[PDB]
Design a protein around this ligand. Structure first.
Ligand SMILES: O=C(O)[C@@H](O)[C@H](O)[C@H](O)COP(=O)(O)O
Ligand SMILES: O=C(O)[C@@H](O)[C@H](O)[C@H](O)COP(=O)(O)O
Ligand SMILES: [Mn+2]
Ligand SMILES: [Mn+2]
Lengths: 189, 189
């Protein structure tokens, strides 16, 4: 009945988890996520760059168990809007999560089902506590890859549809060379 | 309704988490743990050095929640036996754990209730997955502190009792300049 313990090497400098499952999100995988649709179409047809990669070590979906995954969020903008992850709530709403920032400059945008928002700035050494019930997205606000490690219950799941449906209440943009969190003009209510 | 999300800074060089709860284990606190009881007596009377320190950020004991803690495990030997953490089962047996090595050279010893044992070497960048039902102890096999971060369920709790009397089935020693994992002389059922 007892499962096999294991260790894996993580390269903090590159985010790569040796032997883990890898996922790639390119800009073309993110249709309807950025405000500036035209700058999105423009970049997709010109370059279709990698927005982010995930290396994930995941267990069977059972209570008490834990998963972990690194994300490499590459630097870039879609118009004025910084590259980010698609973002999600968890399928189970009574599940928290911990992020450990490893390299680069970024932050996490967070929101409840109602629409109340939170921004937490992330730099190397930052550990962020993601409480039960908050959807969460990370954003790279710098010019180098933003790299972090996430630890999360094996049974949490992922609800993306709700974020693909409504987006987040706030957006993170650069404006006069200054980084700002402001209202999403597309937002529901 | 809804807990605040938060970030705290963790210094990967020192293990220090600003404002977290600091716990100190000194060698006197570990009577009956090391094989060589007379080296134990001697080092205690002569110094009572700190074996390890813990910086824990903990939530109430609710299922789905997560705690994180750093340990700084200092270098040393009680006789041939390297410095370790006391070790424990989780009070809710079916709760996993994830460790991230930050500094120094070390490893983890792991044991089932019936007594299956495993050794997992740890260096900067190693991530160790601790399955449900496995007791776990970390050991510093080098000359500088062994610093790691752990993330665990808020309701996992601790079973120290079992380990204190039965011990671990294997021990980690220096011999003729060589690090070895061998049978534990003080071990029965
Ligand atoms: O578990 C998490 O929350 C993260 O590992 C994310 O899955 C990862 O950062 C990729 O983002 P998303 O799942 O929002 O595409
Ligand atoms: O949660 C854990 O498993 C760790 O944070 C340990 O408690 C920590 O390393 C100290 O060891 P122990 O609790 O065995 O004294
Ligand atoms: Mn998540
Ligand atoms: Mn533990």
């Amino acid at each position: 009945m007892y499962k096999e313990p294991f260790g894996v090497k993580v390269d903090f400098e590159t985010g790569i988890i040796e032997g883990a499952k890898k996922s790639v999100r390119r800009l073309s995988d993110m249709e309807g996520y950025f405000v500036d649709e035209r700058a999105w179409k423009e970049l997709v047809e010109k370059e279709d760059p990698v927005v982010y990669e995930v290396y994930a070590v995941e267990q069977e979906e059972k209570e008490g168990d834990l998963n972990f995954a690194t994300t490499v969020l590459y630097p870039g903008k879609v118009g004025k809007e910084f590259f980010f992850t698609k973002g999600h709530f968890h399928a189970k709403l009574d599940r928290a999560e911990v992020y450990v920032a490893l390299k680069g400059k970024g932050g996490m945008l967070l929101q409840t089902p109602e629409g109340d928002a939170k921004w937490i700035s992330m730099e190397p050494g930052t550990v962020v506590y993601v409480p039960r019930g908050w959807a969460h997205r990370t954003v790279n606000i710098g010019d180098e890859p933003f790299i972090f490690l996430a630890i999360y219950p094996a049974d949490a799941g992922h609800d993306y549809g709700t974020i693909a449906e409504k987006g987040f209440s706030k957006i993170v943009i650069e404006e006069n060379g200054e980084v700002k969190v402001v209202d999403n003009p597309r937002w529901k209510k």
